[PDB]
Design an enzyme around this catalytic site. Structure first.
Site, PDB file in Angstrom:
ATOM      1  N   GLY A 133       0.716  -1.441  -0.052  1.00  0.00           N
ATOM      2  CA  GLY A 133       0.099  -0.002  -0.017  1.00  0.00           C
ATOM      3  C   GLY A 133       0.724   1.126   0.084  1.00  0.00           C
ATOM      4  O   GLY A 133       1.776   1.421  -0.666  1.00  0.00           O
ATOM      5  N   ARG A 135      -0.852 -10.697  -0.351  1.00  0.00           N
ATOM      6  CA  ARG A 135      -1.940 -11.619  -0.970  1.00  0.00           C
ATOM      7  C   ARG A 135      -2.167 -11.525  -2.246  1.00  0.00           C
ATOM      8  O   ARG A 135      -2.543 -10.239  -2.524  1.00  0.00           O
ATOM      9  CB  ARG A 135      -3.077 -11.553   0.135  1.00  0.00           C
ATOM     10  CG  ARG A 135      -3.768 -10.684   0.258  1.00  0.00           C
ATOM     11  CD  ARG A 135      -4.844 -10.392   1.362  1.00  0.00           C
ATOM     12  NE  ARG A 135      -5.377  -9.188   1.582  1.00  0.00           N
ATOM     13  CZ  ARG A 135      -6.457  -8.711   2.193  1.00  0.00           C
ATOM     14  NH1 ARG A 135      -6.902  -9.804   3.024  1.00  0.00           N
ATOM     15  NH2 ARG A 135      -7.012  -7.568   2.193  1.00  0.00           N
ATOM     16  N   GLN A 165      -1.899  -7.319  11.542  1.00  0.00           N
ATOM     17  CA  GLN A 165      -0.790  -7.793  11.716  1.00  0.00           C
ATOM     18  C   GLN A 165      -0.528  -8.892  12.467  1.00  0.00           C
ATOM     19  O   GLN A 165       0.293  -9.946  12.446  1.00  0.00           O
ATOM     20  CB  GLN A 165       0.418  -6.737  11.982  1.00  0.00           C
ATOM     21  CG  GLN A 165       0.536  -5.760  11.254  1.00  0.00           C
ATOM     22  CD  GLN A 165       1.551  -4.481  11.735  1.00  0.00           C
ATOM     23  OE1 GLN A 165       2.137  -4.823  12.705  1.00  0.00           O
ATOM     24  NE2 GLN A 165       1.679  -3.555  10.939  1.00  0.00           N
ATOM     25  N   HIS A 173       5.602   1.155  12.824  1.00  0.00           N
ATOM     26  CA  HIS A 173       4.883   1.537  13.932  1.00  0.00           C
ATOM     27  C   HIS A 173       4.952   0.578  15.001  1.00  0.00           C
ATOM     28  O   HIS A 173       4.713  -0.770  14.556  1.00  0.00           O
ATOM     29  CB  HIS A 173       3.362   1.936  13.596  1.00  0.00           C
ATOM     30  CG  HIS A 173       2.576   2.515  14.648  1.00  0.00           C
ATOM     31  ND1 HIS A 173       2.908   3.199  15.656  1.00  0.00           N
ATOM     32  CD2 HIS A 173       1.277   2.251  15.111  1.00  0.00           C
ATOM     33  CE1 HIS A 173       2.181   3.454  16.394  1.00  0.00           C
ATOM     34  NE2 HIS A 173       0.996   3.028  16.015  1.00  0.00           N
ATOM     35  N   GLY A 219       2.848   7.512   2.775  1.00  0.00           N
ATOM     36  CA  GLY A 219       3.905   7.128   1.731  1.00  0.00           C
ATOM     37  C   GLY A 219       4.114   7.723   0.579  1.00  0.00           C
ATOM     38  O   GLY A 219       5.352   7.837   0.243  1.00  0.00           O
ATOM     39  N   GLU A 267     -13.400  30.050   7.982  1.00  0.00           N
ATOM     40  CA  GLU A 267     -13.054  30.656   9.026  1.00  0.00           C
ATOM     41  C   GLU A 267     -12.460  29.873  10.010  1.00  0.00           C
ATOM     42  O   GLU A 267     -11.736  30.012  11.017  1.00  0.00           O
ATOM     43  CB  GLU A 267     -14.015  31.603   9.793  1.00  0.00           C
ATOM     44  CG  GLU A 267     -14.351  32.920   8.787  1.00  0.00           C
ATOM     45  CD  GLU A 267     -13.555  33.832   8.486  1.00  0.00           C
ATOM     46  OE1 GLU A 267     -12.388  33.807   9.057  1.00  0.00           O
ATOM     47  OE2 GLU A 267     -13.803  34.876   7.830  1.00  0.00           O
ATOM     48  N   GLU A 280      -8.750  28.446   6.151  1.00  0.00           N
ATOM     49  CA  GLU A 280      -7.834  29.414   6.432  1.00  0.00           C
ATOM     50  C   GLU A 280      -6.773  28.767   7.324  1.00  0.00           C
ATOM     51  O   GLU A 280      -5.794  29.458   7.593  1.00  0.00           O
ATOM     52  CB  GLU A 280      -8.167  30.666   7.007  1.00  0.00           C
ATOM     53  CG  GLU A 280      -8.803  31.387   5.624  1.00  0.00           C
ATOM     54  CD  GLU A 280      -9.493  32.837   6.172  1.00  0.00           C
ATOM     55  OE1 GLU A 280     -10.465  32.893   6.810  1.00  0.00           O
ATOM     56  OE2 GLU A 280      -8.583  33.807   5.941  1.00  0.00           O
ATOM     57  N   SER A 327      -2.096  39.666  12.045  1.00  0.00           N
ATOM     58  CA  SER A 327      -2.415  40.768  12.047  1.00  0.00           C
ATOM     59  C   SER A 327      -2.195  41.135  13.893  1.00  0.00           C
ATOM     60  O   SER A 327      -2.323  39.865  14.541  1.00  0.00           O
ATOM     61  CB  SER A 327      -3.696  41.325  12.219  1.00  0.00           C
ATOM     62  OG  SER A 327      -4.770  40.801  12.729  1.00  0.00           O
TER      63      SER A 327
END
Lengths: 324, 324
Positions: free
Chosen positions: B25, B47, B84, B106, B132, B225, B229, B250
Site C-alpha cells: 500500500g 496476498r 498484523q 509503527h 507513503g 474561518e 484558512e 495581524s
C-alpha cells in the site's frame, strides 16, 4: 449564500474611477499591483518612508495619505487595524467628497464604529482569504485567492458593484466570491482565529507538548507528534476535508481520532468557545484590544515575551535548524 | 537526543540481504520503491490481488506473504496494524530463521505484545513522519521524510545498523533521523494523533463550526474561518514555530490568539489529554482498537458513517468543488 465568479460581476463599476490604495504593505502592494495589471487607475497614498519610495519605484503615482484621498474616487484602506482610526480622522476624513467610496479588507473598525464614514460616501469590503504575497502571486500566475465582499453603507447605489468589481480586479472573482455583511465578516473572522485557527490551535499544540514532556517523553519527539506532523494533516483537510485526511492516516490513528477527539474537546470546550463568541459580539474583545494598544501594548508585550520562552519554541527552533 | 544523517549511518547493513516488504500500500510501495532505487534487493509479499500484479509489473519478484518471508533475510511488515497479529502468526512466524530481522513502521503490535518475535531474530523500526506518497515523492525529488528508528530486540548485534540503513535506503537520512524506543514511538505517536493532530484538531474545528452555525452565521463563511484558512497558519508554524505565525498575522489576530486560546484550551482540557495518555499507556486503547477489529469494526463503522454526514463535510465538499 452561493459562490459568485466573474460572470456574476454585472457592472464594471471601477471604469473611470481614480483608485487610491492607502498603505503599501503586503496587502496594499498586492491589491494595487493586481488592479493595475487588470487595467484600473491606481495611485498610492502613504506616509513618507520606505513604503513611499518602494511605491514610487514600483511605478505608482505616490502621494501622502491626506492628498491621495483628495485625488481619488475609491479609497481602499489597507493599514493595520490599530492605526486606521487615527489615520482616518487626521488624513482621510477631511478629504472625502460626497459620492466617493471607501474600502476595507477587514470590518473591525467600521463594524465596531471606531470609524464612522459620512452617509454620502459608500463603504465596501473585499476581503481575500489569503496573505498579500499570495493574493499578488496567484494573480500573476493567472488565478487568484477567494474573497468575501460586503457593503456597510450604500449612498450612491453603486457600492455593491464597486465591491464586486474590486474583487474581480484583484483576481478574486477568478476563483470564487461570497457575499457577507460587515457584522458577519468581522465576528466570524475574529471568532475563527481566536477559537480555532490561532488561539485554539496553538493552545492545543502547547497543551499536548506539556502533557508529553511532563510525563517524561523526549521533547524532540514530542515536537514532531504535536506540531511538525500537523502540516500534512491540515494539508489533507484543506484538499479533501476530514474524509481525505482520515483515509491517508493509519487505521490506528483514525480510530484514535474518533475515540479520543471527543474526550479532549468536550461540551465544556464548546461552552468556552461560546463565551469567546459572546465577547466578540458584545464589543468587549474589541475594546480590550484597542485599550491595550492605547496603553502602549502592555498585555501584548507580556504575552510575546512569555511566548518567546516556551520550551516548544526553543526545541522547535533547534530542530528546524537541523532540517534545512 | 540529536538528529542523525547519512554520515551517521556507519555500516551498510542491508548489504547482501534479501528484503521482503509485506504489504504494498502507501507505506509499502514507498519503502519498497525507495529501497529499490537505493539498490537493495527487494521482493514484495502480499496476498493475491491488487498489490500482487502491481509489484509483478513494477518489476518486483512478487511471491505470497509466506513465500516472501521464507526467501528474505529482512522482513518489513507494512500491513494494517489490526491485521498484523493474525497475519504474523499464520504466514510470517513459521518462515523465519535465526538471524533474520523483522521490521515495523509503527510500534503498536510489538510494544503492546500482540506480536512476539523469537529471541534469535532482530526487531527494528523505521517510522517515517509522513504518508507513503510523500515518503516516495520527497525521495524522487532528491530528499526525503524524516524518520524515527528504534530496536526492540537485538539478537545479532546488527539491529541498529539495519534500522539506520533502512532509514538511509528510503531517503530519511537525507533530512534527519531520531533514535527512540518502541515504547516512546508507540505511545507518543498514539497520543499525538489522538490528542492533537487528528482527534483534537478535527474536534476543535467541528466545535468552532457548530458554535458559529448554531449562532446563526453562514456555514459557507464558517467553513473558511475555521478550516480553509488553517493551512496558511499551520504552514507558518511548520516553517518558523508559533513565533513566525504570530509575527505574520495581524496584531488583532495575534492579540486574540493570546487572550482566547487559553479560554478555550483550559487546565481541564489538559487533564482530558492526561486521561487520553493514561489509556494509551495502560493498554486500554490498544485492546479497544484490536477488539473492535475482531468484532467486525462496528465502532469504526458507525464513526465513519457519522463523519460522512457532518454538515462541515458536506458544505466543504461543495465549496472545494466550487474552487477548482
Amino acid at each position: 449564500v452561493q459562490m459568485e465568479y466573474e460572470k456574476d460581476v454585472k457592472v464594471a463599476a471601477l471604469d473611470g474611477k481614480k483608485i487610491a490604495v492607502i498603505g503599501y504593505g503586503s496587502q496594499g502592494h498586492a491589491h494595487a499591483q493586481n488592479l493595475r495589471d487588470s487595467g484600473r487607475d491606481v495611485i498610492i497614498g502613504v506616509r513618507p518612508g520606505k513604503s513611499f519610495d518602494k511605491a514610487k519605484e514600483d511605478g505608482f503615482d505616490t502621494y501622502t495619505v491626506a492628498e491621495a484621498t483628495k485625488l481619488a474616487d475609491v479609497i481602499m484602506i489597507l493599514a493595520p487595524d490599530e492605526i486606521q482610526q487615527e489615520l482616518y480622522e487626521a488624513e482621510i476624513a477631511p478629504n472625502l467628497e460626497a459620492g466617493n467610496a471607501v474600502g476595507f479588507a477587514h470590518g473591525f473598525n467600521i463594524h465596531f464604529e471606531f470609524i464612522k464614514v459620512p452617509a454620502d460616501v459608500d463603504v465596501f469590503m473585499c476581503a481575500p482569504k489569503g496573505p498579500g504575497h499570495l493574493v499578488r502571486r496567484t494573480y500573476e500566475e493567472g488565478f487568484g485567492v477567494p474573497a468575501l465582499y460586503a457593503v456597510y453603507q450604500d449612498a450612491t447605489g453603486n457600492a455593491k458593484n464597486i465591491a464586486m468589481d474590486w474583487c474581480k480586479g484583484v483576481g478574486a472573482a477568478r476563483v470564487g466570491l461570497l457575499e457577507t455583511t460587515y457584522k458577519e465578516e468581522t465576528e466570524e473572522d475574529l471568532f475563527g482565529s481566536q477559537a480555532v485557527l490561532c488561539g485554539g490551535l496553538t493552545a492545543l499544540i502547547e497543551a499536548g507538548f506539556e502533557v508529553l514532556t511532563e510525563a517524561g517523553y523526549a521533547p524532540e519527539l514530542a515536537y514532531f507528534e504535536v506540531l511538525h506532523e500537523m502540516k500534512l494533516i491540515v494539508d489533507l483537510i484543506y484538499e479533501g476535508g476530514f474524509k481525505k485526511m482520515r483515509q491517508s492516516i493509519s487505521n490506528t490513528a483514525e480510530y484514535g481520532d474518533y475515540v479520543s477527539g471527543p474526550r479532549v474537546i468536550t461540551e465544556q470546550v464548546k461552552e468556552n468557545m461560546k463565551a469567546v463568541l459572546a465577547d466578540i459580539q458584545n464589543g468587549k474583545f474589541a475594546n480590550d484590544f484597542v485599550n491595550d494598544y492605547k496603553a502602549g501594548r502592555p498585555k501584548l508585550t507580556a504575552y510575546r515575551e512569555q511566548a518567546a520562552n516556551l520550551e516548544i519554541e526553543k526545541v522547535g527552533a533547534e530542530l528546524r535548524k537541523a532540517m534545512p
